[PDB]
Amino acid sequence: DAERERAQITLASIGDGVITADTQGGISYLNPAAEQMTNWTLDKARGLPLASLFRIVDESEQILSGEIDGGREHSKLVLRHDGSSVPVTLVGAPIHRGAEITGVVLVLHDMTRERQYMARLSWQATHDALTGLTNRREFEYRLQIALERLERNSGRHALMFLDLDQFKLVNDTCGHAAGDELLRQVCTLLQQGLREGDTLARLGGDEFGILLENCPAEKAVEIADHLRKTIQDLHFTWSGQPFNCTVSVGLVHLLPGISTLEEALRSADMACYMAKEKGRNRVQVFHQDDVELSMRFGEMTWVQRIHLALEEDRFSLYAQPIVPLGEGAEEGLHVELLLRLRDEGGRLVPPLSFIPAAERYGLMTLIDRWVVENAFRTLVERAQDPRAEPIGTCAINLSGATIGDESFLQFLTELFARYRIPPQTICFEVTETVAVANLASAIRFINELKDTGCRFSLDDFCAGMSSFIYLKHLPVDYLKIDGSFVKDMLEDPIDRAMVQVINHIGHVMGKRTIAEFVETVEVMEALREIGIDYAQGLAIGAPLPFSR
Amino acid sequence: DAERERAQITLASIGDGVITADTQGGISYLNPAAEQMTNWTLDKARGLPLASLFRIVDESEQILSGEIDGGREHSKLVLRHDGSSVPVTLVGAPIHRGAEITGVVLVLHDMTRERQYMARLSWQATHDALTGLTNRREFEYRLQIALERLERNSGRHALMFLDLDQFKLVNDTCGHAAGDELLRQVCTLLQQGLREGDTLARLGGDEFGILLENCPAEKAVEIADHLRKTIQDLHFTWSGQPFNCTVSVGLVHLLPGISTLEEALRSADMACYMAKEKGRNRVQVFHQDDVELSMRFGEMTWVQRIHLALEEDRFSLYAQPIVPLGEGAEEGLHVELLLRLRDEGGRLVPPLSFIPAAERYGLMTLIDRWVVENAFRTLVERAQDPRAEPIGTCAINLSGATIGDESFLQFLTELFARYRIPPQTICFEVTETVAVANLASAIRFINELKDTGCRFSLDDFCAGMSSFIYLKHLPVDYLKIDGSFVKDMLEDPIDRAMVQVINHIGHVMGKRTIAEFVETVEVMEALREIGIDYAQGLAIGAPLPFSR
Numbered sequence A, B: 001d002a003e004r005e006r007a008q009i010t011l012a013s014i015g016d017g018v019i020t021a022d023t024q025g026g027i028s029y030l031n032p033a034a035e036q037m038t039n040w041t042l043d044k045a046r047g048l049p050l051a052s053l054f055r056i057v058d059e060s061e062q063i064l065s066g067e068i069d070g071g072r073e074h075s076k077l078v079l080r081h082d083g084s085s086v087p088v089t090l091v092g093a094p095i096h097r098g099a100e101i102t103g104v105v106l107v108l109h110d111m112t113r114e115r116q117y118m119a120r121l122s123w124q125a126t127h128d129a130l131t132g133l134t135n136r137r138e139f140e141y142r143l144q145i146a147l148e149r150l151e152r153n154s155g156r157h158a159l160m161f162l163d164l165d166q167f168k169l170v171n172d173t174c175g176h177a178a179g180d181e182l183l184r185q186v187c188t189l190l191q192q193g194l195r196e197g198d199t200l201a202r203l204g205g206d207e208f209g210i211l212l213e214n215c216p217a218e219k220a221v222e223i224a225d226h227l228r229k230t231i232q233d234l235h236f237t238w239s240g241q242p243f244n245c246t247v248s249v250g251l252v253h254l255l256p257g258i259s260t261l262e263e264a265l266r267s268a269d270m271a272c273y274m275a276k277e278k279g280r281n282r283v284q285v286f287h288q289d290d291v292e293l294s295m296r297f298g299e300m301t302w303v304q305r306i307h308l309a310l311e312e313d314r315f316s317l318y319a320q321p322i323v324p325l326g327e328g329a330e331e332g333l334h335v336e337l338l339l340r341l342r343d344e345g346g347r348l349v350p351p352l353s354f355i356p357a358a359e360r361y362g363l364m365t366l367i368d369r370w371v372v373e374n375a376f377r378t379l380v381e382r383a384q385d386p387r388a389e390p391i392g393t394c395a396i397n398l399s400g401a402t403i404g405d406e407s408f409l410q411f412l413t414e415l416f417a418r419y420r421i422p423p424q425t426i427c428f429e430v431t432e433t434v435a436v437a438n439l440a441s442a443i444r445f446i447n448e449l450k451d452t453g454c455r456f457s458l459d460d461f462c463a464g465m466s467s468f469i470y471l472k473h474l475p476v477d478y479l480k481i482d483g484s485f486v487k488d489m490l491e492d493p494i495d496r497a498m499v500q501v502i503n504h505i506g507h508v509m510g511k512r513t514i515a516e517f518v519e520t521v522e523v524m525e526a527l528r529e530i531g532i533d534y535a536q537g538l539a540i541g542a543p544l545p546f547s548r
């Protein structure tokens, strides 16, 4: 028929190598990308078997009909025995007549070409890969421009910071895949709610940035409260399970030519934080005095609260085990230390009820110094018993305020001399987020501590070319997979794949891998098969009191 | 016909959204990816015009028939007026009957899906994006494994470092595109030359790594000299123009369980460097004494050579102008300082004849201290004339040895007090390579110097998600496009695109862009249209004597 002409132009427009072959291997179709990949033209390869022209090997075939579908991409090579190797990502699907398997369709994507996608790189550098919206880079650029521009700067602009409430709930409850969907759904609503000219970005985490150029004060607040309402009305559900999605909005009225970029960003931050501190699901319009006096008050309140607790011995330490998944590995006892705070009545205070405030008001060095001192102190008390399970690894999480703290090493040195805890026994922890936020200091800190003889771990680790590049510079011993990826590993094929990639590249880069949120033995066995070195979760052991 | 069944399964296996429409817009085909992208099924969209179902807008159509082909990818959005926006990279080709334009074929790739390609990320993290071979990460991993492995460690291994000779020649002569082809061609020969089990990687630049596990000493050297010969016999040509490709090989015989990874890498480096220092196109087998005594001798030779030159006033400084491309921009005179060395006879010494040796033997701090001192000294002498063209920017290149030098800032402070040159007038330069090689120190150095009031530039800048991520951490004022990209900008569509992306993302990140190797006004006008802030090259001004 004349359909061949239509299909051939479509098949030739596709940049990916398309190969169609009969059930027995004989070639039926090769598009120009397949021809260039295999070094064989269709006219010289038609009817001839696949294996006799080129090889689709691995790194040292009929499986497609069985189980190796086109759902997932498979890393193969194209060994052509002339011009040799071409690295691909294969996808295969059977060809049917109607319950009669007649052939095979192969979609082959050339890994060498990825470097040539200039529009893709450019897009990526200015947009969030998940949500599709502009990123922090592009947003801050557009915000700066709105203020510095010579033209079209007649009226005032409106900066908004919209942060999702209890977004960690969604991730720790269902997993990372669920949280990504919610983010994508939150994205579509804020898209529908804004007009052309308005700039909407994901600034990181569950935080979005909205810019309304040349829009009045009353109009600006009206839009914010409406967007707040539309997210409140979002009936988000994950595999039946419904979630109450809510947002905390921080609004700032801007002036082009007067108000600086860093002043604008910081003002929207205090207002967003204040809407949270004021109970969540609220819009907090920044006022230079009215919404600033509460920051001075909040600092005073928390200085008193953190110091009282410390003085009143209400902070305590818990220990959760980390165990080797490797068959034959014994080692010393590995525990991760976790902080707990009890109020004046004597009941446990949730983490979000004081860590965000202590972090905001620079009270984290205090707590980290108390944690480290009382961990070493406990280890001495625990050692008084000879029968006691000796701790080979005691992991402690440090904040960004500590990573940057010049006086921490002298304090740690002093602590070592006082409690005689071997440095080797201690494993300091920093999140991927905290490390990158203070990159030059993190590198400097990790190396100084490693010289002392301490180990280091990188927490809440995501996979990407960025995170793996940051990993080259961060000399940590362990890599800890974010729990959200482990939570639905066995239910979501991308989260399972994420775990596998974090593991492989983590092993490639000389790191030992740890999986958190291993709540069942099914998850434990899955991680063991993959190759994960350590497991932590409710299937391993629950957090138990450590300190007295 | 029954061809529809064959084509539909192929079209459904493609992950990219395929849209086929008539010349007048009416839809003919949508694959499941196109249906999911546009929110419209083919059964409910067949015959109906494109524009009336969804919109393929931009960020604020018939052009395809004219000029906007499927050769280059175009960044568009898919505004569907229901579930709103989907960010794509469009490619379009006309549909013919035979010189009769009947319709249009659109290949739409969803930018949101890029995050889900796990096999692609994993491949990327373990392989060079250009050459397709394993990267430094994977190679060092495999090398470590060869040494640390409990099993299959019977015999000895062979580490090889193959570095292309005068590879900068190919790039500065033809451009980056030519050099990439040569690298890809060098890759295919080393592929054909090695057997299954042998590990071949691009370790960076024009340097390749080869590992021959459980291969005798005599066999190991035999393979190296053969590979050296096959590259010598490579008749490389770029658009008619032939190039004599040659390689300098450094070989090390390894022992699993004794010889460490860093000892192995360093030994292959000294042997490769020695084959270069010994005249290039040679294989230098590392010998612990015989090929180590020459490193002590070479250090002695160069300490004497660099100090003599300094003592004998044979080092001089040249100045090359940098000019604004922006229409209306005047500014002060911008010059880039370049070092030159004259031998004992009085004739100019090529850069490769002393900078590789001075860099190898730690003599770069010396030269950088002489350059900076004599630049400030010249600026005072030049200022004695009131008529003199005042220099608003004087750019000086600093080495990795300087970026890491703790005593440089006190020396610079002293120089400032002695020659009273305004810090603002000085622009320090570091290559992307040097910055990343010493990342924590570069960041620390750039910020300390910026506080003094100096400007900073990032040289030989490549584009990628890695380089743009490194750029977030490096607070430089200017970004300098690598000349190799500018050389064939007007002849190669990818190098033109590279220039455009380096520019856009450089402007996004608050940097001012500079293009080097602007040898013609055609290149100058091209860069001006793109948006480049500054131009440097033989169309602007040639390097002229600066120092006396």
Ligand SMILES: Nc1nc2c(ncn2[C@@H]2O[C@H](COP(=O)(O)OP(=O)(O)OP(=O)(O)O)[C@@H](O)[C@H]2O)c(=O)[nH]1
Pocket (backbone or CB within 6 Å): A130, A163, A164, A165, A166, A167, A168, A169, A171, A175, A176, A177, A178, A179, A180, A183, A204, A205, A206, A276, A280, A352, A356, A460, A484
């Ligand atoms: N699924 C997913 N989760 C992410 C992503 N980026 C960050 N997160 C998670 O988002 C959460 C952000 O937590 P927070 O905003 O600090 O805390 P919260 O639970 O929302 O509580 P509030 O203080 O009320 O904001 C963490 O659990 C992160 O691991 C992403 O791209 N995808």
Ligand SMILES: Nc1nc2c(ncn2[C@@H]2O[C@H](COP(=O)(O)OP(=O)(O)OP(=O)(O)O)[C@@H](O)[C@H]2O)c(=O)[nH]1
Pocket (backbone or CB within 6 Å): B130, B163, B164, B165, B166, B167, B168, B169, B171, B175, B176, B177, B178, B179, B180, B183, B204, B205, B206, B276, B280, B352, B356, B460, B484
């Ligand atoms: N086209 C291209 N050029 C690259 C790439 N990576 C690095 N280069 C260039 O490769 C060159 C490496 O130069 P060198 O090896 O130090 O110098 P050389 O000219 O080969 O001289 P020798 O000292 O004999 O090795 C520089 O011009 C780099 O800019 C790449 O991926 N593609």
Ligand SMILES: [Mg+2]
Pocket (backbone or CB within 6 Å): A163, A164, A165, A166, A167, A206
């Ligand atoms: Mg939140």
Ligand SMILES: [Mg+2]
Pocket (backbone or CB within 6 Å): B163, B164, B165, B166, B167, B206
């Ligand atoms: Mg070279």
